[PDB]
């Protein structure tokens, strides 16, 4: 009936002054735009169909044509930026915001989905969706005593759309918009559905990706213990955004970092630093580097949780990107740590895996490792154990590597290696 119609046929039907012919032609468009292989999105746009579909959204008396035009437009809006712009230029945003008030849950859900694709395009369309007043009718759809009474697919679409209103930077979402959405986000962060939890975490990860003022807004809502609980989930789609949110928070103040430690995040790190997914190990090691960039009492919490042997582990064997993040964790620790904490680090066997990485063809990691060697030597000066450390570096072939680095292309590497050889190996 409405399967495999040409764009020409769809235009003929939509241009008839017959509501039923228009409904059949809109369903035919929807079925075309729903096909897996190459939907003719640009052909539908060039035929001037978008304003016609947008005007069908207003046909309150024909709920089927509202659903069909809403689905058709959602599939166009899910395309490239140009294809999303075409939907916005067709006047779809206020028309989709009105549809959130529809008594039909399947039409209302379609409007949610469409707005999520529009807001997801970038900052400008996100902020345009907010200026047309989408947040209040969206949040009113979740104004229920228990989220479990809502349809699973419906709740997942709403959470996803709200996460897209939290997404993108330059600029970040309006503060006022973030303050309005956050109490609903916190509630979704406690829902039992894994997809709702994954998208709620992603929303939190976006809001924590900014200045300390933005991290504060989130931390003050008391979500860090719930993020730490989600950090221990079995589902990788929940752990990934949970770890990103936690990692972002610790880029903030020492006080914000402390909320993460107080919530018990460090107890999850033995499994995160040995996780079979390399992006988890990498981001967990990145999170560690920002905690070792903190206070001496925070470095002490890292020590007390038995995480130093785990940092020795990731430095010894991991994918290069994780090893680079481990080198940063070691330099940060040796920069802010006490003599006792640096002594402990060397005792745990950091020297051999640290010297082995001086063979990597990456100038940033060499600089980071050279800064770490320098800091460790500064602690050995305070103990008069410089000779003992010099022997350890010689014994695992580190001296031969630092000597070679004197004839390096990079100025900073050449100068740092030259200093260590002249100060402790001459």
């Amino acid at each position: 009936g409405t399967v495999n119609w040409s764009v020409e046929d769809i235009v003929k039907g939509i241009n008839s002054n017959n509501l039923e012919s228009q409904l059949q032609a809109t369903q035919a468009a929807r079925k075309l735009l729903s096909r897996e292989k190459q939907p003719p999105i640009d052909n539908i746009i060039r035929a001037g169909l978008i304003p016609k579909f947008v005007s069908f959204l207003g046909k309150t008396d024909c709920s089927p044509i509202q659903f069909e035009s809403a689905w058709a437009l959602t599939n166009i809006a899910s395309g490239t930026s140009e294809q999303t712009k075409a939907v916005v230029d067709g006047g779809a945003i206020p028309a989709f915001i009105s549809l959130l008030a529809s008594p039909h849950a399947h039409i209302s859900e379609q409007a949610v989905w469409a707005l999520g694709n529009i807001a997801g395009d970038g900052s400008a369309f996100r902020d345009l969706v907010i200026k047309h007043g989408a947040i209040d009718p969206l949040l009113a759809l979740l104004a229920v005593p228990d989220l479990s009474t809502l349809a699973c697919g419906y709740l997942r679409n709403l959470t996803w759309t709200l996460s897209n209103l939290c997404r993108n930077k330059n600029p970040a979402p309006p503060l006022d918009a973030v303050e309005q959405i956050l109490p609903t986000l916190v509630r979704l962060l406690h829902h039992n559905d894994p997809e709702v939890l994954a998208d709620s975490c992603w929303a939190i990860s976006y809001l924590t990706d900014g200045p300390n003022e933005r991290i504060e807004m989130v931390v003050k809502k008391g979500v860090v213990p719930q993020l730490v609980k989600l950090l221990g989930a079995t589902e990788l789609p929940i752990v990934t955004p949970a770890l990103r949110a936690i990692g972002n928070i610790v880029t903030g103040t020492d006080e914000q970092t402390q909320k993460v430690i107080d919530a018990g995040a460090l107890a999850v790190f033995p499994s995160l630093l040995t996780n079979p997914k390399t992006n988890i190990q990498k981001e967990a090691t990145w999170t560690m580097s920002n905690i070792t960039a903190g206070r001496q009492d925070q470095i002490q919490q890292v020590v007390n949780h038995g995480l130093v042997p785990f940092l020795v582990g990731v430095l010894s064997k991991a994918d290069f990107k994780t090893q680079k993040e481990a080198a940063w964790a070691i330099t940060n620790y040796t920069s802010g740590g006490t003599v006792e904490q640096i002594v402990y680090l060397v005792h745990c066997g950091i020297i051999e895996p640290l010297m082995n990485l001086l063979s990597a063809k990456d100038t940033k990691i060499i600089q980071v490792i050279l800064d770490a060697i320098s800091n460790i030597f500064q602690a050995a000066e305070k103990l008069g154990e410089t000779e003992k450390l010099s022997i350890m570096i010689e014994e695992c072939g580190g001296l031969d590597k630092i000597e070679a680095l004197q004839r390096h292309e990079n100025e900073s590497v050449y100068k740092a290696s030259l200093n260590l050889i002249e100060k402790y190996f001459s």
Partner: peptide, 9 residues
């Protein structure tokens, strides 16, 4: 000392 996701990756 502290680095953002963009600073690191």
């Amino acid at each position: 000392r502290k680095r953002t996701w963009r600073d690191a990756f």
